[PDB]
Design a protein around this ligand. Sequence first.
Ligand SMILES: Nc1ncnc2c1ncn2[C@@H]1O[C@H](COP(=O)(O)OP(=O)(O)O)[C@@H](O)[C@H]1O
Ligand SMILES: [Mg+2]
Lengths: 460, 457, 132, 167, 600, 62, 25
Amino acid sequence: NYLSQPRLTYKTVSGVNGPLVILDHVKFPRYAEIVHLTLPDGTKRSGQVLEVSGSKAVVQVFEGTSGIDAKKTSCEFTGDILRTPVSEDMLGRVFNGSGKPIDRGPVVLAEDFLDIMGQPINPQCRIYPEEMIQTGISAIDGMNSIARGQKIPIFSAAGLPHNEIAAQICRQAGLVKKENFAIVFAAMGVNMETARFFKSDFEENGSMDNVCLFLNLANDPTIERIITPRLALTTAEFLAYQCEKHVLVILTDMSSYAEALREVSAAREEVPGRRGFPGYMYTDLATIYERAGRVEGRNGSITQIPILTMPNDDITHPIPDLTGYITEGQIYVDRQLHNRQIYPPINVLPSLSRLMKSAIGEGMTRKDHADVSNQLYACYAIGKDVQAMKAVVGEEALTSDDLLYLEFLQKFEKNFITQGPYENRTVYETLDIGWQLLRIFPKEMLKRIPQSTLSEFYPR
Amino acid sequence: NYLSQPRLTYKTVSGVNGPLVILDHVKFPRYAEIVHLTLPDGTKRSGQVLEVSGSKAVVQVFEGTSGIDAKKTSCEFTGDILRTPVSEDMLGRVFNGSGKPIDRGPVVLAEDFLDIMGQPINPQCRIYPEEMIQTGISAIDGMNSIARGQKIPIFSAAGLPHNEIAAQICRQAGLVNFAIVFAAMGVNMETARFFKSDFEENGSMDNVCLFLNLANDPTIERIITPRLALTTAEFLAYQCEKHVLVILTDMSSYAEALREVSAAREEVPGRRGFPGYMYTDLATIYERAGRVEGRNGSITQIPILTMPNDDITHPIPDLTGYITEGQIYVDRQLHNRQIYPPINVLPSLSRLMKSAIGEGMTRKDHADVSNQLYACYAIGKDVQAMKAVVGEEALTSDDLLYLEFLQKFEKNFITQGPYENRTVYETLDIGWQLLRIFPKEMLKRIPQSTLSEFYPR
Amino acid sequence: KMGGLTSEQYHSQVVGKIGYIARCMQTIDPENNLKKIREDYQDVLIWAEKNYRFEEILEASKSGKCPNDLDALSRRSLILQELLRLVSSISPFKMKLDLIESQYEKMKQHVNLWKSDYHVKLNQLNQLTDYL
Amino acid sequence: KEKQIEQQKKIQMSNLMNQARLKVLRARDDLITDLLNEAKQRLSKVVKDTTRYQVLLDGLVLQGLYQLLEPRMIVRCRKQDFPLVKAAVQKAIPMYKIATKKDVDVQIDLEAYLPEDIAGGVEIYNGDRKIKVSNTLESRLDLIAQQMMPEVRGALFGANANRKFLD
Amino acid sequence: STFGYVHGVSGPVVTACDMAGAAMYELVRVGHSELVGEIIRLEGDMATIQVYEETSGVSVGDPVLRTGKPLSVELGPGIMGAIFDGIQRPLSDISSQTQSIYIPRGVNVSALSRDIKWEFIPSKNLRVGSHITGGDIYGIVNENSLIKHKIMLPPRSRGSVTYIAPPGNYDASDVVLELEFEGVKEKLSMVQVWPVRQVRPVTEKLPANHPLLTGQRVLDALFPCVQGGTTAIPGAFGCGKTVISQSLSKYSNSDVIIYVGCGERGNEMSEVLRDFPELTMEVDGKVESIMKRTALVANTSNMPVAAREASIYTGITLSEYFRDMGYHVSMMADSTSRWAEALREISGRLAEMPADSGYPAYLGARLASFYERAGRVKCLGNPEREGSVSIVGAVSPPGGDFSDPVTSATLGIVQVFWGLDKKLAQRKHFPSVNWLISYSKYMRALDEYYDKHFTEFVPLRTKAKEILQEEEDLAEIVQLVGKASLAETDKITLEVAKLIKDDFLQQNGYTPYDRFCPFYKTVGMLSNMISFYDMARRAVETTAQSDNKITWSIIREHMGEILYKLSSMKFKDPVKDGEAKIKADYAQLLEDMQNAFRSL
Amino acid sequence: FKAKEAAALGSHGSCSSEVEKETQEKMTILQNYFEQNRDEVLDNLLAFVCDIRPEIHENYRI
Amino acid sequence: FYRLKKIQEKKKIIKEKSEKDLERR
Ligand SMILES: Nc1ncnc2c1ncn2[C@@H]1O[C@H](COP(=O)(O)OP(=O)(O)O)[C@@H](O)[C@H]1O
Ligand SMILES: [Mg+2]
């Protein structure tokens, strides 16, 4: 079962416009087919058919359209859609956003060829995730706890330390103890300093033989970003669902991915969505984010941690807004905490985990975990409401109870949220630091906690 | 050499839409060419070719498209871009905003025909402006000093006395004569009468040129009006070696006429719907100023703006402040209090002041006095805002010094009256009489050498 | 892409370092006195000194027959350059061969020779020499 | 100071093991490259066996025509092979007419030839030369070999013991 | 074809026909005056062209000469001390040829003069048969007394040397090298040519470890930058974006300065040409004018809008060429907002679908790939050197609003943000840097530098940021509650924050003592202000429990001379006074204030 | 300090030899399995290459 | 509003090209 038929080559380019080449006189054109372009100087580029109509085909070019001409540039149509080679030998390798080697190693000798779009997994064949990942970070493991097979992004902004948060999770993550991760890492549009930081930390942690890197940098072509996450996730699906590994997948700026989609959609002159982004962007992001979880009868999993930069710090922007409707929560990194030199700058109020409710509790972690988590959240919310009042009326207007919330809020940021980049707190250390802060109040104020949990854990 | 071949005339109008007429079957169309239209009733109009493609030309008509038809309207193509006839005989004349006479004199005999767009001066040939113009107005001369060759607009608002300020500057300006070129876009008959009267009353009209477009004149003339004025100023300054002062009246009317034209072409909008290129357009007006190497003339520009709803962040004052070498700001709150001139120093700037002042230029103290007056006025204004919350009884003795300075500064330094003409030295000595309100240890902008020499007086 | 370079650039820069190491070795020691260093550089000095052409050492670099790690060649290349700077800075006077081999071994053991106070002291001699 | 010794040791160990993986990966790639060189040599013997080479070249011509389907087509060949491709075209034309139910004009290019370095086969062009199909034996060998890569891995070096599922 | 013909014209955009073989981003020459433009879209036999000169008077049927090359820059001796337009035409030679105050449309002058002779010295060790590769320095030109101009093999050139010119005086047109590779010879002069839209290669990019010194007390202390850094300076009009850019260009530790003024005033390029020749640095006990190390690219606010893009790429290509000699280069872009505004007009006339505020969807990728050309590097070629480019870009947000698409894209890229405030500028508080919003990402990279050279500094920097942040939290209470409720340590905190805000963070750039502030003067001033804070806080905090106790009002009345001396530290002049005199005076203030607190 | 630096260098120099020995074992095992299977693989490649079987595109209509 | 215009124009152009093609047919 091979394409043994010869490839057609055309010199029938009819227009070049932004990332797009248009051809005519093409024989039975195929949607999503791959094309190879040779420029007059002998340079080669690759592209994908975005639209077909009669003998006309529209190609997006992954390496851009500079130096293309309508007379001497020639296009070879490959007869097929984009299938990447895959193997287990891809662990301990470095590739670009096209999946070509950059480590001075050879090209991938395939164990298989997989369609970069994947294949839809039946909802009947998924397993609900309940194994808790201990990330080592108290603001996560205490209050936004992560199940193995979840998708949960870091929502951040320009100038904030989201790369240090992600790298710390890669160092510190493992299961709760009363196995280790393969890592697949995608960079879209990162600076050289970010690419050096992650790569250097995997070399210095000594774990570089259990990671696969795909790197597209801010000087690399924008249109490779369309396929970069899909190459990373097609690699993770082979490792998880054929080689039975547990995979952690990092997609380090979904905002640069969304910007590349807006370049192509604008060049195609389509009807815009919000802020000029494509009207299909929810459906596009869903085909990236839903490639995660566990399947029936296979002993492997994929966990996704995307990362976003919110333009003007606005969570209501289309990129974070659509992402919240697909992912199982978010971790929110806050400029207010960063300007105060708190690290991690995680704001627990807009942060969420949608799968923690079943990953914690008796036999899973400890029986008090839900009660401490709810009561710490409630006190921090009330502490911010007291602080916002106090900033007008001054301290002489506050009650003793308001000063307990204001003391709790200072102590919670200093002890619970502040942690440092190599400190690895267990869930149990996290929960007991939680009780040392709930000790700021008399039991009559701890109203979210049932009397059995108060009686067993408060007096210690 | 001359265009000595005949002019082609066309009845090939193929569409009319807003201010635009479209002709077809045109022989080798030229971009930015001038066209004369004769209407079915025999009326003449003129337009400019704004786009060309194959045998089609799109022309914008300066007087508008009402009464034009496809069948009978006849268009003559001139073979050339818009050029204006120029001579020194333009001083002591009045023209409308298209350059036609309105004084019962003849048409201009050209000493030359010049392209209305001018041409950008080479940055290597520019001479940096440094000779201070004394306007005689203390708020300008002491805190926003003007160099000969500067661009420095008046930022004002509707109903403020900005014409009276501009007339006082035209009347009083000299160095520590000017030829005047005056342009009006969309002014009322009272404003046209005021400036013409003020020039005639001060006996000055032999050295003035007026281009007038009124509120009832065509709105597309307004986009060529200031370019006719600046082309006249360039001949006077850079061929006849005069010193020229150029007054442009409501750049707000120019910018609104530009928005009207650009909206009718369906071009990319910027903020508040203004043209996406408005900065680049205003720059072709404001950069037509200054001095050049080896020529003894200069052009100084004083444009006048009305800020809509008094907002300095509106696109017109915003993009003007990015291009001009500062601004003089006229404040409604000073005008309501009956201070004159209503100039507020804090929003105002001169970028060329820093090197037009000091030893051998004006007086050695000038920079130090100016910066200390800015510091004391700004702190006095912050005490005045604070006292509205806490009342006089909460103020410390130091607050009462800044609050006394604030009140004396507006009466003595800023307030002046319409024919009072102070020297820089009078302005600086009024400045020191106000700075000595404080102990010398509070004068923290001023170095001890300047204090010890000038403060004991 | 090899390093940051095209493969053609990368293999051309390998031929360049093999050539530059030969020009350094010939000017530190015109006489073959420096036996220990000429043995430590033997892998690259085998391709120079013999009759050869740029396109042949380019094919050998592409084929992996000569040394072709630019990071290893950059480190190797810098140690001869920083030795040659000392020997060239000290123009009329001459060091003993025992001292030359001592300076070489002390440089070769350094973590990052570009940061060294050896590099700084040679910058200061070159600063004085360039003026004179 | 002290932690820099640990960092240097960790990085050096990471670099040693990286370089060791790259050596064993390049070893496979070089062996695969040697096998593709041997396949090109093995095909050159089939070309010199001109009785088989006609049977191949009959197929190479007709398969190019069925990809183009143009009213008029131009066939380009290696100069040594001209009598063989002229026979192949004369067989191809009646099969083409029977299968497509449409007429054709086919011309061998006498004015320009494929290089003498080419192992064998043909290229076919549209009548204005703006579309071509390439059917050289190097084009076939490459087109076939890349699709075979999972099977030449499995045959030369054995199946991966960790890959429990193929689906 | 070698010519197309003009089919249609609309503003800076031209459509041509018979262009069938023309590639994306070729240069063309449009009209009978041969105006330069670049190809920006293809469709059938037509090309769309973006023209770098004014199109007024261009006719349908005019010729469009097809050139087989992209926009490129001539690189060689004659760049230092020059000023160019955005397409690298030399503005002094234009003045010399035309004898007039204007740039003519379609004028050609060679970018580097072919008449001047340069002293060339070949690199001694190169002989016939030497193997040589791109970036190899093969000779040096004594360009001037401040810059030695290294002559090096073009990237994408290689071979064996067949000829090498002896020591002598040569034209930019004389052959100085010959070499061959595939048996085909190449011959080279002292001038190479490079496409401006392509990054010049390097052996490796390096972490940035060494500071870029601006001579400002804010910036150098509070918000540092590095050799190889990226910076943005957003602000409203009249904040200081130009004055910071010019001050950093006059007084800094960079070897070469490239100044790009695109879309900004002609009077400012004239200001640099007046000011910089009169201003000297000192080398071997001898003075040299800073114009000997400087090059300018101009395209003023009334020049052609499409040439603003050409200015940016010209400037960074000139900057990479001197980095490749092993120099540390700073490139200034006097407003990046003016290039984004040029992208918007061309995008509008190409009738494209916009992103935010009408800008093209590719704007963020243009900015991000421009700033990626900064960094510290190992150069190509074999003398084994290192160099850098630092980029400082001004941004001009309309209405002063930093939610501006250009500002918002830029802050997603740059590692240093110096945010300017119009409320500081209106007080004549300069540099108008908002210390609450501004930041630097490089403060950890510089740890090992300060821990060697200025071992007292990082604690002082930390205390100063805390005092300023504490004052910002107090000021919101003070504005509503009316100051009377404050603790004495809070009255101290407000007064010392006022001392820092007024007498440390503030400089006049146009006065001799504060033109430039050395880092010894900067660390010394901050040390004494933070010392007075710690003593005043200790005196209050120690005595506040007793029946008789210190207050800030007692300290004010006891120490008005020390407070006045502390405010006067700024007036000491780094070239009229010595380093020794300034440090001795700041030590005497420390004894004077210690004796005052002993007297409490 | 120096004893810890020398211990790191002695450990590294020891590990480098073992890493190369293991590399030479692995490369030997590849060279054995290659030469044992090369003939069967080539005999399949040329059986695919030499068996042409022409076809028209299935979307073609007479 | 500016993005919803321009879509109207590009649609009008497509209709006019289709009408010209129906005049060619
Ligand atoms: N550091 C400074 N010291 C003194 N004056 C300054 C300083 N910075 C700005 N100014 C004053 O403010 C004016 C505006 O500065 P400029 O750099 O031109 O503003 P911007 O580019 O932000 O629009 C200057 O011409 C000068 O008069
Ligand atoms: Mg500016």
